């Protein structure tokens, strides 16, 4: 049949031509395969006619062809199917529709989108959406939704930007246009540049997102929440989202049993919790226990990380709200979880402990939560974040505390205990870890607990390790042209001397 369809097209008479176009429309409409260049060429001849019927059939046929991957790649080569798109400007509204359709179906491929971004084709695509009929607007919002995929593609979305059209279209009651729009804006808010322009360009956009956080459609809910997160990548919006009362929506989106919504909501709340000013509000809202229990489930580590991180920034921002932080037992649960969870969750928990262990107000409480039962083994970790942070926390917990009981308890056990820790970190050739060990030993001696003094002063291994550290640093400093009286070496040496002064 292609021989008859081709010969029927080239006639130059309108009637055979509308016949051909209809045929093409149906045969493309229910079976879609890989097809040759020769089939494509007639369509190009078909494409330019100014009987509208001919392009509704031709543009529907061609638009139908789009779903198979090959046709879209094939479309770019001709140089092309592009002239028809320029034709889309002419008013006839339903071939406006179908042309926009093919272009919406087309450009899914990146080069396509990059290619489309050239030639100033998309100034019409931004134009197309407003037209009253849902059909053409769905394609228009669909089309650049598809073009919001590459960075510089969205960078020519803002050139001749339809962005105002988008934020206004967020309030559409038609489900799919508004979804296409939320997803478009969400995809745009990935760039720092776009985020900075969006604050003073088309302002009040975020409030619309917050409203969309209560859509009956799950898709709109999720994607809007993710949009809000992407905006909350910056501090401006970190505060601005909170201003719009996005807290209750998020606070309960989290125990939703639809896991994607949970992921989105916890991601968002984490990003906004970055800002210290927010902490108060976030804690007063009942976020804590939901976050706490949410992190425990095994299957999705990403939620675990978002939750632990949220907890960590809440803890890091203010010593407000700290026994308000204690009550949940999440710290008990972070303790239980740190020993048996992915290295991601581990490093997050690690940084969290290191953060909590700074405030002197909570050192004792952390110690009587037997946190050393997790901190000590964590210092063994091959992962530098885990071992490092655990070590820092442990070191801080030995410094200027009002009761040294739990430390004396954790001297030997578990995992060779604090003693083992000190020896290990001295024997490392990591300057940081050497420093942590020496510093901790000094902090212990500088406590006026006699028992601790006697454990440190009688431990031959620890005493020997400090002595060799002192010698090593002394000779590094004497090879480099320095007599005492890198920059780490001097510091380390000084600490060794302060420690060794306790011996006599």
């Amino acid at each position: 049949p292609l021989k008859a369809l081709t010969t029927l097209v080239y006639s130059d008479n309108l009637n055979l031509q509308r016949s051909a176009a209809l045929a093409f429309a149906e045969i493309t409409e229910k079976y879609v395969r890989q097809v040759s260049r020769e089939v494509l060429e007639p369509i190009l001849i078909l494409l330019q006619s100014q009987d509208p019927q001919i392009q509704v059939a031709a543009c529907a046929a061609l638009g139908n062809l789009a779903v198979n991957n090959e046709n879209k790649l094939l479309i770019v080569e001709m140089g092309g199917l592009e002239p028809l798109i320029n034709q889309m400007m002419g008013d006839n509204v339903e071939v406006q529709c179908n042309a926009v359709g093919c272009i919406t179906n087309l450009a899914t491929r990146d080069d396509n989108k990059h290619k489309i971004a050239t030639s100033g084709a998309l100034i019409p695509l931004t134009k197309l959406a407003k037209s009253k009929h849902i059909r053409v607007q769905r394609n228009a919002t669909g089309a650049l939704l598809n073009m919001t995929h590459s960075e510089e593609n969205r960078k020519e979305l803002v050139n001749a930007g339809a962005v105002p059209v988008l934020v206004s279209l967020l309030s559409s009651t038609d489900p799919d246009v508004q979804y296409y729009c939320t997803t478009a804006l969400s995809n745009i808010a990935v760039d720092e540049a776009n985020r900075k322009k969006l604050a003073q360009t088309e302002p009040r956009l975020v409030s619309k997102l917050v409203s969309l956080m209560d859509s009956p459609s799950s898709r709109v809910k999720c994607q809007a929440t993710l949009a809000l997160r992407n905006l909350a990548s910056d501090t401006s919006y970190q505060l601005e989202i909170v201003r719009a009362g996005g807290l209750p929506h998020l606070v309960k989106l989290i125990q939703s049993d639809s896991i994607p919504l949970v992921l989105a909501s916890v991601a968002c709340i984490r990003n906004i919790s970055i800002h210290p000013l927010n902490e108060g509000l976030i804690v007063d809202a009942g976020f804590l226990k939901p976050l706490v229990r949410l992190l425990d489930y095994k299957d999705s580590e990403e939620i675990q990380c978002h939750a632990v991180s949220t907890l960590r920034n809440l803890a890091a921002s203010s010593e407000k709200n700290r026994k308000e932080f204690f009550e949940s037992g999440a710290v008990e649960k972070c303790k239980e979880l740190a020993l048996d969870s992915p290295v991601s969750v581990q490093s997050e928990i690690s940084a969290c402990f290191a953060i909590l262990a700074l405030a002197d107000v909570s050192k004792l409480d952390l110690l009587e939560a037997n946190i050393l039962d997790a901190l000590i083994p964590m210092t063994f970790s091959q992962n530098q974040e885990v071992s490092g942070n655990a070590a820092a926390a442990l070191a801080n917990l030995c410094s200027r505390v009002n009761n040294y009981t739990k430390i004396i308890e954790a001297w030997d056990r578990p995992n060779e205990g604090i003693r083992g820790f000190l020896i290990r970190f001295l024997k490392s050739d990591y300057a940081t870890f050497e420093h942590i060990a020496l510093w901790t030993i000094l902090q212990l001696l500088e406590s006026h607990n006699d028992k601790v003094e006697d454990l440190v002063k009688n431990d031959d291994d620890i005493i020997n390790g400090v002595r060799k550290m002192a010698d090593v640093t002394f000779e590094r400093l004497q090879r480099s042209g320095i007599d005492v009286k890198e920059d780490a070496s001097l510091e380390l040496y000084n600490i060794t001397q302060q420690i060794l002064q306790f011996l006599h």
């Binding site: 509704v56 093919c102 919002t141 969400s186 995809n187 994607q223 997160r229 530098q384 974040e385």
Partner: peptide, 21 residues
């Protein structure tokens, strides 16, 4: 060290596809 997991903004994977009459 403090870790940074899943910190970057997300680009939605969904792409639209057109409808005809």
């Amino acid at each position: 060290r403090q870790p940074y997991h899943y910190s970057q903004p997300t680009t939605a994977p969904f792409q639209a596809q057109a409808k005809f009459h």
